[PDB]
């Protein structure tokens, strides 16, 4: 049955959460390759700050390294270690423009 | 230390996962209101199918209802029950 207000708010306030990021989006210079898997599970700042004049952005960043299969058509494949940026702590901040 | 290939693949294959959806995106006709919270945690089909000719889409859908504060400036506020679409099972399909 129904999820109460206080639960929804707390679970949907700006915090780091497991997000599925496409590898291409992160490394766009690496186009020769086909990546398996094509995306990876990273912690990224999502959720809402409950104000149009504020955005949810990271403060504490870190790195995580994942074994990724990198296929290079008509050439060869291999398991390469690829590093990805993660978010450890998020905060609500003003939109700069 | 390093996450192995088989773990990354399995965790990043098309499956339903907790995604944070903006309420406006779901109900765009309701513009008079300001929603608190402005977004909600729903299960939606994410992840990759590992093929450019395929996309990850839902098969089994369901509904979940959440108490949301709906402010209507210079008028009044209230806790209204708002329904949202969820995904229970995903499958890889052609575009």
């Amino acid at each position, epitope marked *: 049955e129904v999820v109460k*207000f*206080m639960d929804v*708010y707390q679970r949907s306030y700006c915090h780091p959460i497991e997000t599925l990021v496409d590898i291409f989006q992160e490394y766009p210079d690496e186009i020769e390759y086909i990546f398996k898997p094509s995306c990876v599970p990273l912690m990224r700042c999502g959720g809402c700050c*409950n*104000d149009e004049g504020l955005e949810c952005v990271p403060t504490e960043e870190s790195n995580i390294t994942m074994q990724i299969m990198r296929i290079k058509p008509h050439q060869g494949q291999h398991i390469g270690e690829m590093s990805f940026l993660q978010h450890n702590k998020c905060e609500c901040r003003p939109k700069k423009d | 230390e390093v996450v192995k290939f088989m773990d990354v693949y399995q965790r990043s294959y098309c499956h339903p996962i907790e995604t944070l959806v903006d309420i406006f995106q779901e109900y765009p006709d309701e513009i008079e209101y*300001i929603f*608190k919270p402005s977004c909600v945690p729903l299960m939606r089909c994410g992840g990759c199918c590992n093929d450019e000719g395929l996309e990850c889409v839902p098969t089994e859908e369901s509904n979940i209802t959440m108490q949301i*504060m709906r*402010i209507k*400036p*210079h*008028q*009044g*506020q*209230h*806790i*209204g029950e708002m329904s949202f679409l969820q995904h229970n099972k995903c499958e890889c399909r052609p575009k």
Partner: antibody
Framework: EVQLVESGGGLVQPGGSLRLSCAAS????????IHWVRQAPGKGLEWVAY????????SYADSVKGRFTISADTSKNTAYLQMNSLRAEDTAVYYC???????????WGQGTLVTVSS | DIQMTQSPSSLSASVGDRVTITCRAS??????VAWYQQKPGKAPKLLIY???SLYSGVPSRFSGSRSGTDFTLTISSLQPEDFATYYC???????????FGQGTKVEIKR
């Protein structure tokens, strides 16, 4: 010209009932909402209860919940606070105030004095 | 419950002096705070809302400001008719719709 007017406060025996009336003028009381706020002698301001007639939504403060009842006659352009089972602590000055952007109160009533004593 | 804690409790200043009333929130309220002015024997009058914006018809000397939890009403040129009790008020729905502080009785020095 906007104004809120309250009435019906006075002396009541503990455990007694007492009904407060907040009479709106100069705005569509249908298309807006009202707070009740009370202020005990010397002490500061405390939220009692709230109503938003358009969506028949109503909410009360814990210390009051179950004992008071907010209503509103949209026809009469009037809000009511029905107070049952009054205690010594319920002695206060009762203000109704109409609701401003995203919270806050812009227009307040003159305020009626409810005094619970035997 | 969200606790709004006003400082000081009472306060006297001279005519024309700068007066600073602070109001400290327990947990983040956002910019959802209002300041009121209650004369003796009358109802509160709204001065500031959304922490910083001035209500229509309030003289300019009254000015609200913020520091991520510490909210601050500032009367820039105190005047004898500013003698009053000043209340901060937080909203942002959490459990209650809003909450007040204990007040700040201002006085005039002459």
């Amino acid at each position: 010209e906007v104004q809120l007017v309250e009435s019906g406060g006075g002396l009541v025996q503990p455990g007694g009932s007492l009904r407060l009336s907040c009479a709106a003028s100069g705005f569509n009381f249908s298309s807006s909402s009202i707070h009740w706020v009370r202020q005990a002698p010397g002490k500061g301001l405390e939220w009692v209860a709230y109503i938003y007639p358009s969506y028949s939504y109503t909410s009360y403060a814990d210390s009051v919940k179950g004992r008071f009842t907010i209503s509103a006659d949209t026809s009469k352009n009037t809000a009511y606070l029905q107070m049952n089972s009054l205690r010594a602590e319920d002695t206060a000055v009762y203000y109704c105030a109409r609701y401003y952007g995203t919270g806050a109160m812009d227009y307040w009533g003159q305020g009626t004095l409810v005094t619970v004593s035997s | 419950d969200i606790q709004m804690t006003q400082s000081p409790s009472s306060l006297s200043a001279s005519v024309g002096d700068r007066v600073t009333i602070t109001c400290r929130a327990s947990q983040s309220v956002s910019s959802a705070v209002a300041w009121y002015q209650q004369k003796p024997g009358k109802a509160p009058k709204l001065l500031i809302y959304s922490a910083s914006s001035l209500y229509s018809g309030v003289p300019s000397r009254f000015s609200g400001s913020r520091s991520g939890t510490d909210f601050t009403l500032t009367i820039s040129s105190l005047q004898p008719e500013d003698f009053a009790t000043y209340y901060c008020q937080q909203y942002s729905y959490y459990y209650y719709p809003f909450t007040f502080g204990q007040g700040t009785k201002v006085e005039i020095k002459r």
